[PDB]
Design a protein around this ligand. Sequence first.
Ligand code: HEM
Ligand code: HEM
Ligand code: HEM
Ligand code: HEM
Ligand code: HEM
Ligand code: HEM
Lengths: 153, 153, 153, 153, 153, 153
Amino acid sequence: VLSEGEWQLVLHVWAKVEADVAGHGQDIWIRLFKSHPETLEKFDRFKHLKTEAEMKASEDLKKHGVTVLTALGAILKKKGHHEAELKPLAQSHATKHKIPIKYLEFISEAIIHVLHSRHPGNFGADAQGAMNKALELFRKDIAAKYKELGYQG
Amino acid sequence: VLSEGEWQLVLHVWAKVEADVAGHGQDIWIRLFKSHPETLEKFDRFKHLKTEAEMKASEDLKKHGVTVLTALGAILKKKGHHEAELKPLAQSHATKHKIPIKYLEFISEAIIHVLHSRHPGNFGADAQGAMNKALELFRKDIAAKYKELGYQG
Amino acid sequence: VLSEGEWQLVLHVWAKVEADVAGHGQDIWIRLFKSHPETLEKFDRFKHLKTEAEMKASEDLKKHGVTVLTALGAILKKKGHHEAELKPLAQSHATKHKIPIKYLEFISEAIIHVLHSRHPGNFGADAQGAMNKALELFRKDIAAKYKELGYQG
Amino acid sequence: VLSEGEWQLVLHVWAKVEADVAGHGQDIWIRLFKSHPETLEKFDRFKHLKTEAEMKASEDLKKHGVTVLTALGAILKKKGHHEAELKPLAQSHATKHKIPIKYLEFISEAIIHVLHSRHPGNFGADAQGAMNKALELFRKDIAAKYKELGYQG
Amino acid sequence: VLSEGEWQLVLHVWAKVEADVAGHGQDIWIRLFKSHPETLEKFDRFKHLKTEAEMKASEDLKKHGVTVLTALGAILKKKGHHEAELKPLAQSHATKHKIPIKYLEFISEAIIHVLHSRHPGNFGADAQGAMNKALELFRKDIAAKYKELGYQG
Amino acid sequence: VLSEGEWQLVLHVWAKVEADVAGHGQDIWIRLFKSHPETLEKFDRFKHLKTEAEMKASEDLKKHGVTVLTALGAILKKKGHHEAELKPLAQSHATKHKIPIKYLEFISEAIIHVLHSRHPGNFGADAQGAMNKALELFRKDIAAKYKELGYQG
Ligand code: HEM
Ligand code: HEM
Ligand code: HEM
Ligand code: HEM
Ligand code: HEM
Ligand code: HEM
């Protein structure tokens, strides 16, 4: 459980992200696919992208990034009371996309790296500590649902 | 032990399956053999089938699917009081067919995937949770019999 | 410890076996050597047999099967009070033949398969459960003697 | 927790190091890169250096050594009350440089070897014991931050 | 600890062995070297022997067998009170010959096999049980000394 | 902790060693390097020695053996109260020579073998037991210092 103080550090940096959700989505994507190329194989819609240039130019990948960050933002804004938001996401990612927990760890790593680069003034050690805690909370509850749905993860 | 509420979610989606048992049987089969080809080797009657086309055309495989789902349906409708129904099934599958528990897990996975595809309105996160729980109950009791009969599983 | 009820299920099917001990001995043998060929290597008297045809024709192998089943029958009829019968068998099999417990498991598996094939009316799930329990009792006590005699098994 | 006596042994030898921070920085560097060449790969600014001669001649590597030892000195002088000093160092080394704990162990080993060579009169068994304890304290608290920041280390 | 009854079974069969110590020594030797050829490598005095024929003909190997069995007999006759007899044997075998416990297990196995072959009337299941227990007692106390002397065994 | 009786057995045989420290040093050396050639690699001053003949002829290796045994003798004569003597030895062997505990075990083995060969009348089972205990005490306390100094060993 996160403290109100920790939630504030998270929502304060997220308000900066919201100033340009599409741009933030792109940076996270490229970071993820360059650091862990195997994840790209899960996207039959984007697996043909070869270079960073191609990724940056994909209008579809950009739109998907916005969809992703918007869903995550709705979750964070619930400050732990995200049961309703997690159910449909756990179902699709476990049953249709088949995304293991290890990959959620990788994208969490990408989110932190991008926030650290673009928002150093609002992403100091304590702020990163809180964001990490929030994402670990997310993964802990998703992995829980995964088990209930019958997917090891 | 499942709650009455959980059983209801299971029987509600199963009533949809019963509207076309043969068609549901076929989809589960193809899904199983494509996802885990090694299972096909256990069926000396169907191991010669090479493609999805051939499987879809096999009148015998279709009939067997109905026999399978009918037996499973009788079990689910007992809501946990399935001792009598499990004995003969555990004996044949342990002693004659020699089907390991790992393969029952694979077919459970196939059942969930097919229900999720054909009945999204009646197979939400909670419904899938209940169905998974019912199938895990099935496997837990079968594995138990397996041990009693002298088969590791 | 087996219940009187369990012993009855065992002795009831064994009375059928006794109607043709020699034939039952042969079926068990062929089943064992085909399923686990390595066991044949322990019999310097039968290791030259190449096919199922040759095995079925061996008058010596047939006679040995009768000797084996007769010894086992005497044990089962003691309903757990088989200490005297086990000593000489554990000594020869541990010290002279050098038969590991793993091989006693294999022949137990062969006995069950043959009874299941030839006597389905008297070898239902409960009956098989009892027979398995009786054979596991046998192996448990033999393995115990093995240790006392200085053979790991 | 270190005793006041142990801290004194540490600060007494460190006062000698401060008489020539740049020279001490160089010796530690060369010792580290020769003993564990893989660490050099983390420095994109120095990874091109091939020999000890080149390292000794690099004006940039010399300047960096001073920056490093100065930061470490500030930490040691806090005698355990180094929370504020550790936060920014853990953030950069975990998130940007990605330096595993194993590498902090290697540089700790290099520091001890150099002090042992240049200051034997002030680096006896007890003194080395205290310095080791101080560096293990450093690593223990850094590894702790690493976890909070989301880096395994 | 062995019972007086168990000791009697051991000494009763040993009195038969004493009727021909040299012959018993030879049988044990050949059995050991044929079953576990690696043990022969420890005897620089006998490692040149190639066949069973050569072993049976070696006058020196025969004499050594008598020396061995005589020492073992003196131990068994002490019925557990063999501390004085074990010290010099543990010292030479641990420090000079370097004989691991695994090899004492192998020769124990050879002793049992030979007694079983030559004295079936006095080496039934109970008798073998007692002899095994006596030899395990021997090995347990020797391994203990080994540790005290500084040899792992 | 060793008893006064055990210390006496150790010091009694050591008084014999002192009658020819140089000769004893040489025998231990050759035994060590022949049994465990890898240890020679630690001595940059002696690693060029190829044969036993060369070792026996090295005046420097002979002198070093005396230095070694003299230091060990001073330790043993302290009968457990060797804290002051161990500190400088642990520092050099951990930090400069980098000698793992495994190698101290090897030289302990060499010491015992040589005493057993040259002094059988004063190195019986009990005497060897005491000497082993004294050397294990030595290694236990050295390994302890190693940890304090920051060397795993
Ligand atoms: C921060 C974590 C994540 C969030 C909040 C998230 C969110 C979403 C959302 C809202 C959708 C659209 C609706 C749906 O299908 O449920 C989606 C689709 C998808 N997600 Fe995720 N996702 C996350 C991580 C991942 C990761 C790490 C992978 C793969 C390595 C993944 C693979 C997919 C795929 C394959 C789709 C379908 C895309 C398409 O074909 O249109 N997701 N995700
Ligand atoms: C949902 C789980 C399952 C149910 C309810 C089920 C049910 C049945 C039923 C009722 C029969 C006919 C009667 C009998 O032989 O007992 C049967 C036959 C058989 N089952 Fe299953 N089964 C299940 C899973 C499997 C799996 C996963 C395998 C193999 C990977 C398997 C292999 C067989 C075989 C080989 C036969 C014989 C088919 C033939 O040759 O005619 N079963 N099963
Ligand atoms: C149900 C378990 C078994 C029973 C009741 C049994 C019984 C017997 C009996 C009564 C004999 C003759 C007397 C004797 O030597 O003790 C015998 C001989 C023998 N048994 Fe078994 N046995 C069993 C399992 C096995 C197994 C699994 C193996 C090998 C894989 C084995 C290998 C032998 C051998 C090699 C002989 C000697 C045959 C010859 O050369 O004449 N037995 N057994
Ligand atoms: C005694 C432990 C260490 C201390 C006190 C220390 C201190 C520092 C300081 C103060 C900086 C500059 C500011 C910053 O980036 O945070 C720095 C930069 C850096 N450190 Fe460390 N560091 C330590 C160990 C290491 C080790 C062992 C590695 C790698 C094996 C490492 C890799 C780096 C890198 C790559 C930089 C950036 C250099 C550049 O490109 O300019 N550090 N470190
Ligand atoms: C029942 C167990 C054993 C007993 C009672 C025993 C007894 C003896 C005795 C009394 C001696 C002569 C005096 C001495 O050196 O201590 C001896 C010598 C020896 N033993 Fe054993 N021993 C046993 C097992 C073994 C085993 C299993 C090995 C090797 C695999 C072994 C290897 C040797 C060697 C190499 C010698 C020296 C022979 C020579 O070169 O003359 N012993 N043993
Ligand atoms: C009974 C255990 C040992 C004792 C009492 C001992 C004692 C000594 C002493 C007193 C010195 C000289 C002063 C010093 O450098 O501390 C020394 C030097 C040294 N020792 Fe040991 N030592 C022991 C075991 C070993 C072992 C097993 C190794 C290596 C396998 C080793 C490697 C060295 C080396 C390399 C030197 C330096 C020699 C030179 O280059 O002059 N020592 N030792």
